[PDB]
Design a protein around this motif. Structure first.
Motif, mmCIF file in Angstrom:
data_model
loop_
_atom_site.group_PDB
_atom_site.id
_atom_site.type_symbol
_atom_site.label_atom_id
_atom_site.label_comp_id
_atom_site.label_asym_id
_atom_site.label_seq_id
_atom_site.Cartn_x
_atom_site.Cartn_y
_atom_site.Cartn_z
ATOM 1 N N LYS A 67 47.258 31.923 29.655
ATOM 2 C CA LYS A 67 48.614 31.659 30.109
ATOM 3 C C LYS A 67 48.806 30.501 30.957
ATOM 4 N N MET A 68 48.135 30.554 32.076
ATOM 5 C CA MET A 68 48.271 29.683 33.462
ATOM 6 C C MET A 68 46.869 28.977 33.616
ATOM 7 N N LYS A 69 46.143 28.706 32.675
ATOM 8 C CA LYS A 69 44.763 28.473 32.807
ATOM 9 C C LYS A 69 43.838 29.587 33.396
ATOM 10 N N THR A 70 44.075 30.674 33.091
ATOM 11 C CA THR A 70 43.303 31.886 33.076
ATOM 12 C C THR A 70 43.143 32.404 31.705
ATOM 13 N N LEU A 71 41.858 32.612 31.641
ATOM 14 C CA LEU A 71 41.328 33.326 30.414
ATOM 15 C C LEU A 71 41.229 34.798 30.554
ATOM 16 N N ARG A 72 41.872 35.489 29.728
ATOM 17 C CA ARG A 72 42.120 37.075 30.068
ATOM 18 C C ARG A 72 41.964 37.815 28.766
ATOM 19 N N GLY B 249 32.073 41.763 26.422
ATOM 20 C CA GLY B 249 32.127 40.806 27.679
ATOM 21 C C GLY B 249 31.987 39.560 27.765
ATOM 22 N N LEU B 250 32.614 38.861 28.551
ATOM 23 C CA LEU B 250 32.573 37.311 28.666
ATOM 24 C C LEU B 250 31.936 36.924 30.143
ATOM 25 N N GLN B 251 31.096 36.087 30.248
ATOM 26 C CA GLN B 251 30.613 35.710 31.606
ATOM 27 C C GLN B 251 30.720 34.049 31.555
ATOM 28 N N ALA B 252 30.877 33.687 32.860
ATOM 29 C CA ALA B 252 30.815 32.443 33.169
ATOM 30 C C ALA B 252 30.117 31.859 34.318
ATOM 31 N N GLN C 39 40.704 18.954 31.394
ATOM 32 C CA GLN C 39 41.307 18.060 32.640
ATOM 33 C C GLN C 39 41.626 18.912 33.937
ATOM 34 N N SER C 40 42.229 20.169 33.731
ATOM 35 C CA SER C 40 42.630 20.647 35.105
ATOM 36 C C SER C 40 41.961 22.097 35.031
ATOM 37 N N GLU C 41 40.713 22.353 35.596
ATOM 38 C CA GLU C 41 40.101 23.635 35.730
ATOM 39 C C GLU C 41 40.368 24.687 34.692
ATOM 40 N N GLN C 42 39.886 26.090 35.185
ATOM 41 C CA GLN C 42 40.137 27.078 34.295
ATOM 42 C C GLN C 42 39.643 28.275 35.065
ATOM 43 N N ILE C 43 40.271 29.422 34.856
ATOM 44 C CA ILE C 43 39.819 30.643 35.037
ATOM 45 C C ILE C 43 39.484 31.642 34.183
ATOM 46 N N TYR C 44 38.293 32.543 34.421
ATOM 47 C CA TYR C 44 37.750 33.448 33.476
ATOM 48 C C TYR C 44 37.786 34.887 34.117
ATOM 49 N N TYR C 45 38.455 35.718 33.607
ATOM 50 C CA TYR C 45 38.365 37.204 34.034
ATOM 51 C C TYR C 45 37.196 37.918 33.543
ATOM 52 N N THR C 46 35.954 37.835 33.979
ATOM 53 C CA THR C 46 34.691 38.423 33.555
ATOM 54 C C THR C 46 34.716 39.904 33.783
ATOM 55 N N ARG D 162 35.951 34.713 37.761
ATOM 56 C CA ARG D 162 35.132 33.292 37.934
ATOM 57 C C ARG D 162 35.989 32.095 37.574
ATOM 58 N N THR D 163 35.948 30.804 38.418
ATOM 59 C CA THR D 163 36.516 29.742 38.309
ATOM 60 C C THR D 163 35.761 28.607 38.032
ATOM 61 N N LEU D 164 36.078 27.937 36.810
ATOM 62 C CA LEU D 164 35.420 26.564 36.739
ATOM 63 C C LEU D 164 36.188 25.526 37.026
ATOM 64 N N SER D 165 35.780 24.613 37.960
ATOM 65 C CA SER D 165 36.619 23.599 38.665
ATOM 66 C C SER D 165 36.781 22.399 37.370
ATOM 67 N N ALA D 166 37.663 21.538 37.746
ATOM 68 C CA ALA D 166 37.983 20.532 36.802
ATOM 69 C C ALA D 166 36.631 19.643 36.658
ATOM 70 N N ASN D 167 36.365 19.061 35.541
ATOM 71 C CA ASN D 167 35.331 18.129 35.908
ATOM 72 C C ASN D 167 35.433 17.239 34.295
ATOM 73 N N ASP D 168 35.028 15.940 34.453
ATOM 74 C CA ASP D 168 35.193 15.129 33.328
ATOM 75 C C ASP D 168 34.746 15.498 32.072
ATOM 76 N N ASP D 169 33.523 16.018 32.408
ATOM 77 C CA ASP D 169 32.526 16.357 31.203
ATOM 78 C C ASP D 169 33.044 17.627 30.666
ATOM 79 N N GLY D 170 32.735 17.825 29.321
ATOM 80 C CA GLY D 170 33.035 19.294 28.802
ATOM 81 C C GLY D 170 32.207 20.251 29.183
ATOM 82 N N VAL D 171 32.782 21.609 29.045
ATOM 83 C CA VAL D 171 32.076 22.675 29.434
ATOM 84 C C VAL D 171 31.039 23.309 28.460
#
Lengths: 627, 85
Positions: free
Chosen positions: A268-273, A331-334, A242-249, A303-312
Motif C-alpha cells: 500500500k504505502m511502501k509496506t509489504l504485508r 514466512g518472509l524475512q528481510a 527509490q524510496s525505502e521499503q517496509i516488510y512485515y516479517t 523490518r525496514t530497508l532504507s532507500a539505496n541507489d543499488d537494487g535489493v
C-alpha cells in the motif's frame, strides 16, 4: 573459528565413512552401469564380454559382489567397528552444506537415501540377471534386498529423521529494483487444490511460477492434477528502488491437517504485508474442505530497508521441497545489513514419509519440474526431430541439429520460408502474455493472425552473432482463433533459434483504497463549524471534532491534512493510539502513515486544540482524508 | 574450541585406524556371518555355494583370509608403519 571447526569435523567423519564404503560403492556403480541394457528389460562380442563379467559377479569369493553388497548395507546401517552409520554422516554433511539447496533437510537426506537404496536394488537386480544369464540356480535375492532396504529406512526413520528441519527457503538471490506503485498480488489455488511449490526466475524479467495440485492420502500429490500459474509483478512488489521499503516479517504456521491455499501480498504505502489462508485437509481422504484459517503478518515485528541507489537482493530459485508436497507454514524475512529477502516455507514431507514409504507402503514422489508445464508452444525446445507441431511453408528453413541450446535441435531459416506453428486456440483476449526464446543470427519472430493485420508480438533487426535469449511481454486483441507463431529471417539473411516459450501470466489486481472518511460523519462538540470540505475550530470554546472510522486488522493507512493555525490531531482507540501530533504553528500540508495492529475496533480521529484564554482566532483543517 | 579440537584429533586417529583395519574387518565379518550354521555346531545348493567359499578362504595368496587375519592382529597390537594400535 568454531564454525570452521564444525565443518572440519563433519569432513573428518565423511572421510571415515568414505574409507568404509567407497570400494563397495564404486564396484556396485560399475557393475550397475555395465549391465544397463540387460536389466533395462557386435552382439556376440558384447554378450561374451557380459558373460565373462557375470561369471566374475556370481563368483562366491571373499571379495565377491555379494560381499560388497553386504558391506555396503553394514556401513549404511552402522554395523561397523565404531558404531557410525553412513546415513548419519550424510545427514550431518547435508545439514551443513545447505547453502544454495532448493529443498529442506528432510527432503535432501531422504533423496540421498533414495539414491543409495536404488543403487542397492539395481545391484541385486543385476546380480539376479547375471545368475540367469549364466544358467545357475535362482537364489531369490528379494528377501535379502527387502531386509537391507527396510533396515536402512528404519535407521533413517529412528535415528535421522527426528532431528531434521522441514523448512525450505530460496537458494539464490539477485539484484533487482521495482516500482513502488501500490502493488498487490493474490497467489491463489483452485478451491479443491493446494500450493506445493514456487519458482522465482529472473533472466530478463522476473517471473513467479507457482504449482497447484490435489491431494490423495497422507499428504500425497495427484500427478494427474498438476497445474501451473505464472505471475509477472513479483519484482515490482519486493523492491524499494527509490524510496525505502517496509516488510512485515512473521512465520505463519498452521496446525497439522491444514494446507495453505492462498497468499495475499498487499503493498500500500511502501509496506509489504502478506496474508495467508489454509484450508482443512483430511489426512485419510484426499479432499480439502472449505474450513479456512487466515493468518497475517504480525505488526510488532516489521523490518525496514532504507532507500539505496543499488537494487535489493530478491529471491531466486526453486522454493519447494525436493518432492512436491503441501505447505504447512509460510514466512518472509528481510535483512538490512545485507539487504536480503528470503521466502521460507514449511512442508509436510515428514508426515508423508512416516505414513507411507517409511511404513513399507508405496509412494510416487514428484520432483519439481525444471521446465514450464503451462507452456502453450508445443515442442518449444524442439527436441523431437519430427516437427509435427511446427511446419515449413517452403523447401527451406529446416531442423539444424548442430544449432540450438547446446544439445538440442534448433529451427533454422535461410531465404523467405518461415517456420510456423498454430497456437491461436490456446490463448485469451487482452490477457497479458510472456514470450521467451533463444536465437542466433539475424532472426525475425512474429505472432501473427492470418485474419486481420494485427501484429501482437514482433521482433526484428537483431544482429545476434552469438546465441541471445530474448524475453518480452505483450497482450492479445483479435480473432485469436487464427493466430499463430512464425519465425523468418530478416530480409534474406539466415538465422536459427530454439527454446520457444509463451506463458499466460495471471492478471494483477489493482489495490483499491477506500476513502474511509466522508464529510457527513463529523461528530462535533463545542464551538466548531464544518463548511463543505473545511473544518473550523473556534478559539475559546471547548469544542472538538471526533469521527468514527472502520479500519482493518493489520493494515496501514495514510492521513492527509492541510491545516492553518495551531492544531492537534489524534487517531486512536479507547485504550490504544495509532497516531497523535500537535503540529503547533506550522501545519500547511502533512501526510502521515499509521498502522492498526491487532485492534480493528472503536477507532476515531479527534481534531482538537486545548487552551484557556485564547478567544477570537480560529484553526482550520482542509482535505482531511485517510487512504 | 579446545574441546572441539580434542574431538577432531580423536576422529582423525580413528580415520587412520580405519584406513588400516577396515578391509580385514569387513572380510572377517562377512566370512563369519556366511559360515554361521557350519561353525554353529537346497541342501546341495548351499553346500556347493559354501564349498566354493571354503576354496576361496583356504587359498594361499597374498590377499588370502590368513593375510587379513594377520593384518587385523597387527593393527590391533600396533605393528603398523607408525606405532599406533
Amino acid at each position: 573459528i568454531s564454525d570452521k571447526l564444525d565443518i572440519i569435523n563433519v569432513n573428518v567423519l565423511i572421510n571415515s565413512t568414505l574409507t568404509e564404503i567407497t570400494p563397495a560403492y564404486q564396484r556396485i556403480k560399475y557393475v550397475n552401469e555395465k549391465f544397463e541394457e540387460l536389466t533395462f528389460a557386435d552382439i556376440l562380442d558384447e554378450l561374451t564380454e557380459l558373460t565373462e563379467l557375470a561369471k566374475s559377479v556370481t563368483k562366491n569369493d571373499v571379495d565377491g559382489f555379494e560381499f560388497y553388497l553386504n558391506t555396503f548395507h553394514d556401513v549404511m546401517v552402522g554395523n561397523n567397528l565404531f558404531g557410525r552409520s553412513a546415513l548419519k554422516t550424510a545427514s550431518e554433511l547435508i545439514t551443513k552444506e545447505n547453502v544454495k539447496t532448493s529443498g529442506s533437510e528432510v527432503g535432501n537426506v531422504y533423496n540421498f537415501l533414495i539414491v543409495l537404496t536404488a543403487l542397492q536394488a539395481k545391484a541385486f537386480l543385476t546380480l539376479t540377471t547375471c545368475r540367469k544369464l549364466l544358467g545357475l540356480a535362482d537364489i531369490d535375492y528379494t528377501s535379502i534386498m527387502n531386509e537391507h532396504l527396510n533396515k536402512e529406512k528404519e535407521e533413517f526413520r529412528v535415528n535421522i529423521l527426528p532431528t531434521l528441519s522441514n523448512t525450505f527457503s530460496n537458494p539464490n538471490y539477485a539484484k533487482v529494483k521495482g516500482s513502488d506503485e501500490d502493488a498487490k498480488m493474490i497467489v491463489e489455488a483452485k478451491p479443491g487444490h493446494a500450493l506445493i511449490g514456487f519458482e522465482i526466475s529472473n533472466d530478463s524479467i522476473t517471473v513467479l511460477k507457482v504449482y497447484e495440485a490435489k491431494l490423495k492420502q497422507n499428504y500425497q500429490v495427484d500427478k494427474d492434477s498438476l497445474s501451473e500459474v505464472i505471475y509477472g509483478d513479483m519484482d515490482k512488489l519486493l523492491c524499494p528502488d527509490q524510496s525505502e521499503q517496509i516488510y512485515y516479517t512473521n512465520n505463519i504456521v498452521f496446525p497439522n491437517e491444514y494446507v495453505i491455499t492462498k497468499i495475499d501480498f498487499t503493498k500500500k504505502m511502501k509496506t509489504l504485508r502478506y496474508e495467508v489462508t489454509a484450508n482443512f485437509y483430511d489426512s485419510s481422504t484426499g479432499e480439502i474442505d472449505l474450513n479456512k484459517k487466515k493468518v497475517e503478518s504480525s505488526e510488532a515485528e516489521y523490518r525496514t530497508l532504507s532507500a539505496n541507489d543499488d537494487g535489493v537482493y530478491m529471491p531466486l530459485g526453486v522454493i519447494s521441497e525436493t518432492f512436491l508436497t503441501p505447505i504447512n507454514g509460510f514466512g518472509l524475512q528481510a535483512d538490512e545489513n545485507s539487504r536480503l529477502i528470503t521466502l521460507t516455507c514449511k512442508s509436510y514431507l515428514r508426515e508423508l514419509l512416516l505414513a507411507t514409504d517409511l511404513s513399507n507402503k508405496e509412494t510416487k514422489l514428484i520432483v519439481p519440474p525444471s521446465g514450464f508445464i503451462s507452456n502453450i508452444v508445443e515442442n518449444g525446445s524442439i527436441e523431437e526431430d519430427n516437427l509435427e507441431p511446427w511446419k515449413a511453408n517452403n523447401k527451406n528453413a529446416y531442423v539444424d541439429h548442430t544449432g540450438g541450446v547446446n544439445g538440442t535441435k534448433a529451427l533454422y531459416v535461410h531465404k523467405d520460408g518461415g517456420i510456423s506453428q498454430f497456437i491461436g486456440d490456446k490463448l485469451k483476449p487482452k490477457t497479458e502474455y510472456v514470450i521467451q526464446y533463444t536465437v542466433k543470427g539475424k532472426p525475425s519472430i512474429h505472432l501473427k493472425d492470418e485474419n486481420t493485420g494485427y501484429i501482437h508480438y514482433e521482433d526484428t533487426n537483431n544482429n545476434l552473432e552469438d546465441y541471445q535469449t530474448i524475453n518480452k511481454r505483450f497482450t492479445t486483441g483479435t480473432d485469436l482463433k487464427g493466430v499463430y507463431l512464425i519465425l523468418k529471417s530478416q530480409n534474406g539473411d539466415e538465422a536459427w533459434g530454439d527454446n520457444f516459450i509463451i506463458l499466460e501470466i495471471s492478471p494483477s489486481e489493482k489495490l483499491l483504497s477506500p476513502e474511509l472518511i466522508n464529510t457527513n460523519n463529523w461528530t462535533s462538540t463545542g464551538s466548531t463549524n464544518i463548511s463543505g470540505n473545511t473544518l473550523t475550530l473556534y478559539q475559546g470554546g471547548r469544542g472538538i471534532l471526533k469521527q468514527n472510522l472502520q479500519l482493518d486488522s493489520f493494515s496501514t493507512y495514510r492521513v492527509y491534512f492541510s491545516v492553518s493555525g495551531d492544531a492537534n490531531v489524534r487517531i486512536r482507540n479507547s485504550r490504544e493510539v495509532l497516531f497523535e501530533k500537535r503540529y503547533m504553528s506550522g501545519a500547511k500540508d502533512v501526510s502521515e502513515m499509521f498502522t492498526t495492529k491487532f485492534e480493528k475496533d472503536n477507532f476515531y480521529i479527534e481534531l482538537s486544540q486545548g487552551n484557556n484564554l485564547y478567544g477570537g482566532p480560529i484553526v482550520h483543517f482542509y482535505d482531511v482524508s485517510i487512504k
